[PDB]
Structures are given as structure tokens and as C-alpha cells.
Design a protein around this ligand. Structure first.
Ligand code: EH0
Ligand code: EH0
Lengths: 365, 362
């Protein structure tokens, strides 16, 4: 039953998890990411920051996994994800006393982060496998599902924040001292063409749709640059984040469109509008897929119904102070909207708030 | 000598009884129906009145002592007392039933003014005691409850007065009180637009045109009808049309061509959905919440309580009204209604120790 958990205690994991969970994550601004990848920033500064910050981020969400209901925590797949987090925490602990001045320390660190990044590739579908194990062994009682939903939103946001920190280090400090003008600052494109990412997400969605259905709706894109009419819309953002969101929304829109036109020769196209206002960058994906009743929208956002594309797409949106909302018209079609900050100064990491007291203070006149 | 508190304390110990749209429909014009309605409403109205009256008396003293709030409270006392006269009277006596119906019409007329008067009180509080953000989430909470309470009470009174009025050739003989069992949604959309266009034309010399598309999913060619209260649907559509037109005209101050307001009406198995789309330039996501706030909304064609109260009408029969904007482009407002009259049940404020503690905390 409990071999992975035994192996973890014998490793001293709890000592370290208890230690690092006593501290709060440090949220970084988009500006801080940009500047910490400008030349003036150092591999040593990043090393000394990430060898404290990663373990704190890892320890906090590890503490929180161990607060799940025992019916889920004892699922093989959850125990497995927990073992990957122990290994990764331990991996970074090797670096606590090592010398920043030593070029071999910095090199080994970067390789450890890449190993960690690769270790955690399958985390999402594995945690989903654990939730299915719980669902298909116990009930579908609506109290335990708002519990799992709460934890999973935190876990997956935590995970996005950790891969971001690792991606910035590995991509910026990939071995040698490199030439002048990098197109990206790590994973951040400071001149991200939103429509190019829409087309990318569509291209891959259309490929998959064409494999499994043999039809796929076409794409129409309109841009609205309010301030500068008809200038192509750029922003500072992480294209892979925007792509993850758009990919999932394209898959759902295409599924609904194809499944609601079994007998049609024309498929209604998927319409995407990109609007840039003073404060918001807004991306509407409109389909004529026959829509969902208002009562079942909540379900689309639930891990208990992978299925995890929409919930996790929302988490990516929320991570840099955005949102993702979905409005359907049963009998007609569905509108999905990504809301992003137009300004890079308005973009700070939104991280789960940890170490809140279980004791609630009472309030008077 | 006249013991409002006695009665307020008594009737507030009971829970309102939510009715289904079906239950409203089933009430025939019979003497047997009039008696059932009389004996039901002489308990239910006072319970509905007592509950929201108890809750007004828990508001912060900064609000409760405003002239306009004291006034609304006095109208609720008068109306409660009015109904109390009927508690021991005989339903079997035809003169009892007739006097009751006249009392309800008097009550209906007494409360015509209530919405702008409560709003006047909120302005009195704002402009005397300011905006500390704790007391504003308190007033928002109270106002949503008060105005939903009010919709549920006018519905009960409207059904009684309109059904048991007793005039020979009525206005709407198709209707069961205020309920149209064959309500043509698009006809109400056109009505709401016509009045909105009139007002828009008065205050600006331009007004956007209307386009309507219907999607009857099950029965493709057939015009979309439902069981609903047309006046409810009209209040919601009127407010949404006024806002869309205001935004459209103010974002094209110098344009001779205005982009039209597009309305789609979709009927699915469960939902009837009405989307109103404008190219009014839209609102940033951060300010949507404000549009739904009683504290912000003096309309800075503007009323301010229109959107919050339109949502309450939507929620009253288990619907919703949501707005999604695209800053720089335009706004979509959606009314969600139940397609089926069996799914349509009164949503009333839940009255209990937890709901009444919100006026002590955060
Ligand atoms: O399950 C998950 O958590 C996410 C997995 C995701 O899988 C879904 C999927 F790709 C598409 C739909 C769907 C339908 C539908 O046509 N049918 C589903 C059904 C269910 C019940 C009823 C009914 O009771 O009438 C009607 C339609 N209509 O619009 C959407 C739709 C949903 C999303 Cl999230 C989107 O971004 C775009 C869309 O067009 C529902 C999905 F679920
Ligand atoms: O009567 C009522 O229910 C509420 C009445 C409060 O008055 C408002 C109003 F009618 C319309 C808008 C508005 C604007 C706009 O942009 N208006 C001007 C402005 C522009 C920029 C900003 C900003 O950048 O902050 C703020 C306001 N764009 O779309 C809407 C809009 C709003 C609603 Cl609720 C609707 O159903 C349809 C709409 O098109 C905003 C209101 F506030």
C-alpha cells in the first residue's frame, strides 16, 4: 500500500517540508521577470533566490496535499505525485550549502531544475487519475468535491508558478554566455503578437480535430485596437500560457461544433475577436456548437466531472491577474473570453495565500 | 396604542412560502379560488412584510435614521396593519373578499414610489455619513434582499387584484393575472426597444436600430413563446436597451450612422436566453462589479438601480442576468430564463440568524 510514503519519511522529507512551509512565497511582477533576465541580472542572484524560493513553493503545496481527505491522499496516483515533489525538494536541498562563486554549482543547479521540470511533465493527468480513482471507489458527494476543487485550483496555480520560475532560469542561463539580443526574456515575449498565438493554438487544435472527427471548423479572426485603429495587437506575455488557454478553448469549441453538425456539409466557423482597451486585452472565442444550459456551466469548471483544460486555462489566466469566463446560449452556441492585463506593470504573480490561521477572528460595530 | 412591533415579531418567526409558476397559473377566477387566495395572502403577505421589516430595523443607525428609509418603514407598518384588519374576518362573506381586494390595491398604490424612495435614503446616507467600504457591502446586501422581497410581494398582490378585480370586458383576457401563458418574447423585445428608442431620441437626436434573430432549437421555424410575466421581461429589456443606447451614442458622439443593437433569442430544452450585443466601446473587467452596485449607480438615459434590479427580476423565477464586456469594442448582456414553467419557482431572501448577522460583522 504505503511504500512511496514510507520511503519519503525514511528520507527526512517531513523535516524539510515543515521547515520551508513556515515561509510565504514571494510573488514576482512581470517587470521583475523582465529585469532579472536583462544582462544586469546574475546567474548567482537567481541561484540564491530559487534555492530558497522553489523549496518554499514546493513545501507549501506539499503541506496542502497532506491536508486532502484520506480517501484521495491514499490513491496510488496522488501518492505518486507526492513522491515526485519529495524527490524534487530533496534534489534542491543538495544545493543549500554549495558555493555560488563556483561555476560548477550554477551548472549542476540548472541541470537539477531541468530534471525537476521533466519529472513533473505528467503531474496534471496523474492527479486527474487519482481523482478518478477516488470517484470510481467512493461516492460523488458534493461536499468532498468543493474540497478537491478548492485544493486542485491551488495545486495547479502553485504548479504554474513553479514551472515559470524554473523556465525563466533554464531558458536564460542555458549553459554558456550568449549573444546580445535574445527575442525572448526566458519564456516572456516582450512583443507577443496575440493573433499569431491564436493561429498556432488553432493549427494544433485543427490537427487533433481532423484526426478524431475528420472534419474541423475554419477560423475567422478580427482585431480591435481601440487606441491605434488597425495596428496589429502586441503585448508582453508568456506565449506558452496564452497557447495553453487558446488550445483548450479551441478543442472544446471544435468538439461542440462537429458533434452538433453530424449531418451538415458546412461547419459554422469559430470566430475569435482580439480587443485591446486602456486596461484590458480581451479574446472572445465564439462557436455555434449548440451551447450548454446555464445550470451545467459550473460543471465545465469542475475537476470532479482529463476534463481539466477549462479549469487549468482559467488558472493560467488568473496567474498574471487575468480571468477566463464562459457564457453559453443553449440551442445556439458558446462564447469564451480570456481577460488579460494590457499593461505589464499590472501583471503580478497571483499565488495561493498559504499559512492563513484555521482560527477566524470575529468582527463588531 | 397600535402594536406594529407585536405583529412584526410574531410574523417574522415564519418563513415565506415560495410558489411555482404552475401554482400561479392553476388559480381560476372562482369564489372557491378567491377564498383560497384570501386565506393564503392574509398569512403570507404579513410574513413577507414582517421578515423584511425586521431586517430594515437591523440596518446601521446611520441609514435607518435617514428620512426616506423611515418613510418606507412607515408605509410597510401601514400596509401590515391594513392586512391585520382581515385576520379574524370570515372568508365565506362576499364583502370581506371585496374589501380585501380594495386593501391590496391601496397597498399596491402605497408602494409605487418605494424603489426611488429607498434610493433617495441611500443618497441621504452617502451624502451625510460618506462611503466607508464596510457599510457599502452591508447596504448592497440589504438592497438586493429588499428589492427581491418587494418583487415577490407585488407579484402576490398583482395576481390577486388582476384575477379577482371583477370588471366585465378586461384588458388582457389571455392572461392569468400578470402571467401570459403564451408570452411572445420578441414582441416584448420590440416594446422595450420602442420606449428605449423614444427616450434616446429625446436626449440625443440619434438612436441605434434593432436587429433580432430567434433560434428555436427543437422547432426551427416556430416563433418563440413561453409562460412568463411580460412586465418583468419588459423591465429587464428596457434597462438593458437604455444602457446599450447610452454607451452606443456616447462612444459615437459625432457619428450619423450608429452600430445597431443586436438581440438574439434562443430556446433550448432547459433555458430561454436573450443576448443584447452593442458596439458601445465596453467596460474594463475591473468595473463590471460597479454596474451591479447601488452605491455607485446614479448613472454617472440613466437611473442607476436598473441593472441590479433587472438582475433581481431575472433571479426571481430562477433565471440570471450576466454582462460580459470587451473594453474598446462593446458589451453583451444576457437574460437567462427557465424554458419550462415547472422549473420556475420564486427565489425569496432566506431570513435567518446567519443572514441577519451580516449587519454586525466584516
Ligand atoms: O467535462 C468537462 O469538465 C470539460 C470537457 C469539455 O467537453 C465539452 C465540450 F468540448 C463542449 C461542450 C459544449 C457544448 C455541447 O454541445 N454539449 C455538452 C452538453 C451536455 C449536456 C447538455 C444538456 O443537458 O442539454 C447539452 C450539451 N456546447 O458548448 C460547449 C462548449 C463548452 C466549452 Cl468549455 C467551450 O470552451 C466551448 C463550447 O462550445 C461541452 C463539454 F463538456
Ligand atoms: O441604469 C443602470 O442599470 C446603470 C447605468 C450605468 O451607466 C452606464 C451605462 F448606461 C452604460 C455603460 C456601458 C459602457 C460605457 O463604457 N459607458 C461609459 C464609460 C466608459 C469607460 C469607463 C471606464 O473606462 O471606466 C466607464 C464608463 N459600455 O457598455 C456599457 C453597458 C453597460 C450596461 Cl450595464 C449595459 O447593459 C449595456 C452596456 O453597453 C456604463 C455605465 F456606467
Amino acid at each position: 500500500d504505503k511504500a512511496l510514503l514510507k520511503n519519503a519519511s525514511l528520507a527526512g522529507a517531513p523535516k524539510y517540508i515543515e521547515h520551508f512551509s513556515k515561509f510565504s512565497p514571494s510573488p514576482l511582477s512581470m517587470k521583475q521577470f523582465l529585469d532579472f533576465g536583462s544582462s544586469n541580472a546574475c546567474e548567482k542572484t537567481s541561484f540564491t533566490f530559487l534555492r530558497q524560493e522553489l523549496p518554499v513553493r514546493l513545501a507549501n503545496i506539499m503541506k496542502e496535499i497532506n491536508l486532502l481527505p484520506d480517501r484521495v491522499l491514499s490513491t496510488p496516483s496522488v501518492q505518486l505525485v507526492q513522491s515526485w515533489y519529495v524527490q524534487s525538494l530533496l534534489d534542491i536541498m543538495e544545493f543549500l550549502d554549495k558555493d555560488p562563486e563556483d561555476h560548477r554549482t550554477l551548472s549542476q543547479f540548472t541541470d537539477a531544475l531541468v530534471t525537476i521540470r521533466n519529472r513533473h511533465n505528467d503531474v496534471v493527468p496523474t492527479m486527474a487519475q487519482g481523482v478518478l480513482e477516488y470517484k470510481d471507489t467512493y461516492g460523488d458527494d458534493p461536499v468532498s468535491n468543493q474540497n478537491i476543487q478548492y485544493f486542485l485550483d491551488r495545486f495547479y496555480l502553485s504548479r504554474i508558478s513553479i514551472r515559470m520560475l524554473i523556465n525563466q532560469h533554464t531558458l536564460i542561463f542555458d549553459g554558456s554566455t550568449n549573444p546580445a539580443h535574445p527575442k525572448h526574456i526566458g519564456s516572456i515575449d516582450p512583443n507577443c503578437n496575440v493573433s499569431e498565438v491564436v493561429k498556432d493554438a488553432y493549427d494544433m487544435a485543427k490537427l487533433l480535430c481532423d484526426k478524431y472527427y475528420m472534419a474541423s471548423p475554419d477560423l475567422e479572426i478580427q482585431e480591435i485596437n481601440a487606441a491605434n485603429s488597425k495596428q496589429p495587437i502586441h503585448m508582453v506575455y508568456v506565449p506558452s500560457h496564452l497557447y495553453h488557454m487558446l488550445f483548450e478553448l479551441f478543442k472544446n469549441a471544435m468538439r461542440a461544433t462537429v458533434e452538433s453538425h453530424e449531418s451538415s456539409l458546412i461547419l459554422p466557423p469559430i470566430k475569435v475577436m482580439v480587443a485591446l482597451g486602456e486596461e484590458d486585452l480581451s479574446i472572445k472565442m465564439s462557436d455555434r456548437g449548440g451551447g450548454v444550459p446555464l445550470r451545467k456551466i459550473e460543471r465545465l469548471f469542475s475537476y470532479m466531472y482529463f476534463g481539466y483544460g477549462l479549469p487549468i486555462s482559467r488558472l493560467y489566466a488568473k496567474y498574471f491577474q487575468g480571468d477566463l469566463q464562459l457564457f453559453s446560449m443553449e440551442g445556439f452556441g458558446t462564447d469564451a473570453v480570456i481577460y488579460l492585463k494590457a499593461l505589464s506593470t499590472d501583471s503580478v504573480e497571483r499565488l495561493p495565500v498559504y499559512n492563513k490561521s484555521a482560527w477566524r477572528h470575529y468582527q463588531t460595530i
